[PDB]
Amino acid sequence: PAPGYQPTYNPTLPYYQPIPGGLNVGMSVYIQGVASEHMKRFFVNFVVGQDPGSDVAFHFNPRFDGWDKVVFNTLQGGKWGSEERKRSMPFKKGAAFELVFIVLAEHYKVVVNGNPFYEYGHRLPLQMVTHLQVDGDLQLQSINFIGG
Ligand SMILES: [Ca+2]
């Protein structure tokens, strides 16, 4: 079922749902979860459409092979762009987290546990984004959309 502006508790992964009202400036996405002890995969995508192969305006991808880092990128016309990386890891083994994306005119502002983490500049117009996709072997307590 499509989300509204009330929290969705214990969503099942993989999660792939339409953003209520489409994506607009001022909107925030709140994700409460726990980064599992044996978590190997985790990503959040702001997607243009619901079909496989759809463009991804913003791919947010904590990575753990070798040195831990968070990767940020865009998939457009079947092509991945130049990767951005932040060489630090704000998620901790087995630890609860609050992950927030605030959609501003210039960038997605990413805040983790109340601490500003990154600002991903828009590459595709943010208004093209229609769906939120989340997957990984972690446990989500809730996903919540706050309208702008
Ligand atoms: Ca590692």
Residue numbers in the entry: 5 to 152
What does the primary publication say about this deposited structure?
Galectins are a family of glycan-binding proteins characterized by their affinity for β-galactosides and the presence of one or more structurally conserved carbohydrate recognition domains (CRDs). The tandem-repeat subtype of galectins contains two distinct CRDs (galectin-4N at the N-terminus and galectin-4C at the C-terminus) connected in a single polypeptide chain by a linker region. Galectin-4 belongs to the tandem-repeat category of galectins, together with galectins -6, -8, -9 and -12. Galectin-4 is composed of 323 amino acids residues, which can be divided into an N-terminal domain (aa 1–150; galectin-4N), linker-peptide (aa 151–178) and C-terminal domain (aa 179–323; galectin-4C)19.
To elucidate the full structural architecture of galectin-4, we solved the crystal structures of galectin-4N and galectin-4C at 1.48 Å and 1.78 Å resolution, respectively. The final models for galectin-4N and galectin-4C are comprised of residues 5 to 152 and 184 to 323, respectively and share the same structural features previously described by Bum-Erdene and co-workers. The carbohydrate-binding site is located in a shallow pocket composed of residues present in the S4/S4′, S5/S5′ and S6/S6′ strands and the S5/S5′ adjacent loop. The residues involved are His63/236, Asn65/238, Arg67/240, Asn77/249, Trp84/256, Glu87/259 and Arg89/Lys261 in the galectin-4N/galectin-4C structures, respectively. Structural analysis of both galectin-4N and galectin-4C domains, which share a root mean square deviation (RMSD) of 1.2 Å between Cα atoms, reveal a large difference in charge distribution when the electrostatic potential surface is calculated at the physiological pH 7.4. The galectin-4C surface charge distribution is mostly positive, whereas, the galectin-4N surface displays a more heterogeneous distribution with a positive region localized in the binding site. Arg45 in the S3 strand from galectin-4N has been identified as the main residue to interact with a cholesterol sulphate ligand and to contribute weakly to lactose-3′-sulfate interaction. Reference curves resulted in sigmoidal profiles with respective Tm values of 55.92 ± 0.05 °C for galectin-4, 56.8 ± 0.1 °C for galectin-4 N and 68.12 ± 0.05 °C for galectin-4C. In contrast, the larger RMSD values observed during simulation reveal that galectin-4N can be more plastic, a characteristic that allows this domain to be more promiscuous in carbohydrate recognition and binding, as well as more potent in achieving a biological response.
